[PDB]
Amino acid sequence: VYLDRKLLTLEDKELGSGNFGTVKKGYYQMKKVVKTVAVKILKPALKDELLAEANVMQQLDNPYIVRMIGICEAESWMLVMEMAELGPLNKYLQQNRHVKDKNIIELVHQVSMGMKYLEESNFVHRDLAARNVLLVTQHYAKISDFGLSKALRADENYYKAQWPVKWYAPECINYYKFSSKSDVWSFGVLMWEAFSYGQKPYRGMKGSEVTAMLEKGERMGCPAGCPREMYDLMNLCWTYDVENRPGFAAVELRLRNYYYDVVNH
């Protein structure tokens, strides 16, 4: 897990920031080949935050989740991850307006496969948004950004916080309780983003106005040209009651079946 700084070259290419610090493109010399990487660079609590994120990524092994190469202790603490060259899903759809519905379905279905694995592993993501979905290719999506992620206690199906509010389920906002079903709500917001060509959800609204909207039983309207089946699935992800809301196994299956209806014209 510990990487050699002399084997890492940081490119003059920024992929993200904050916070925290910056994300830079880089190249890491492996045992024989160089690997293209994304390097999360820290610039006291922020150190433990990065190490807990590294500890979460170390435990995960699925084709639809970004792979961590390792950690690097140098000028700054660094988290070295495999590069997804096409970048975030929202930015991609904003700039590539001719992506077919079949293709958007294929991508969000891959996200649902990665989340089904996270659900089975009893980890909660807590930052599941289109900006955190990375494209390896136009037909291959991966879940990234485990900065808010938690390993659930063995005796509880939720993490209690002691925030990307527009992606959060009511139980998160009201009770600070985060479960895999809370990630399903976020997934519904992500699907809305993907079918709105990366438009931000709840445009022009304050967090408190979003809470009020949701509590009155209101939800974002159907994106122009969105398949009805996909909008219906978003509304099922947006079930107020955690108990009636589907888990990722049920979501993955519905997306998979709908994908085959679309693939076969």
Ligand X SMILES: COc1cc(F)c(-c2nc3c(NCC4CCNCC4)c(Cl)cnc3[nH]2)cc1OC
Query: Binding site, residues?
Result: 15-23, 40
- Answer for the pair 64, 114: CB distance below 8 angstroms, yes or no: yes
Residue nearest to ligand X (CB): 87
Distance CA(13)–CA(63), nearest Å, equals 26
- Residue with Cβ nearer ligand X (87 or 207): 87
Q: Which stretch binds ligand X (CB under 6 A): 27-35, 98-106, 129-137, 150-158?
A: 129-137
- Residue with Cβ nearer ligand X (112 or 233): 112
What are the angstrom distances between the C-alpha of 259 and each of 67, 185, 203, 230, 247?
Answer: 26, 21, 29, 10, 19
> Closest approach of Cβ 20 to ligand X, in Å?
11
> Closest approach of Cβ 101 to ligand X, in Å?
23
Of these, 53, 106, 145, 193, which contacts ligand X (CB under 6 A)?
Answer: 145
- Residue with Cβ nearer ligand X (186 or 258): 186
- Residue with Cβ nearer ligand X (40 or 150): 40
> Closest approach of Cβ 81 to ligand X, in Å?
4
- Residue with Cβ nearer ligand X (64 or 158): 64
Using CB under 6 A as the binding criterion, the count of chain residues that bind ligand X stands at 17
> Closest approach of Cβ 192 to ligand X, in Å?
18
132 binds ligand X (CB under 6 A): yes
Q: Of the residues 101, 127, 183, 261, which is catalytic?
A: 127
> Closest approach of Cβ 37 to ligand X, in Å?
8
50 binds ligand X (CB under 6 A): no
Query: Is-catalytic flag, 183?
Result: no
Residue ranges in contact with ligand X by CB under 6 A: 15-16, 23, 38, 66, 81, 83-85, 87-88, 91, 131-132, 134, 144-145
The catalytic residue positions are: 127
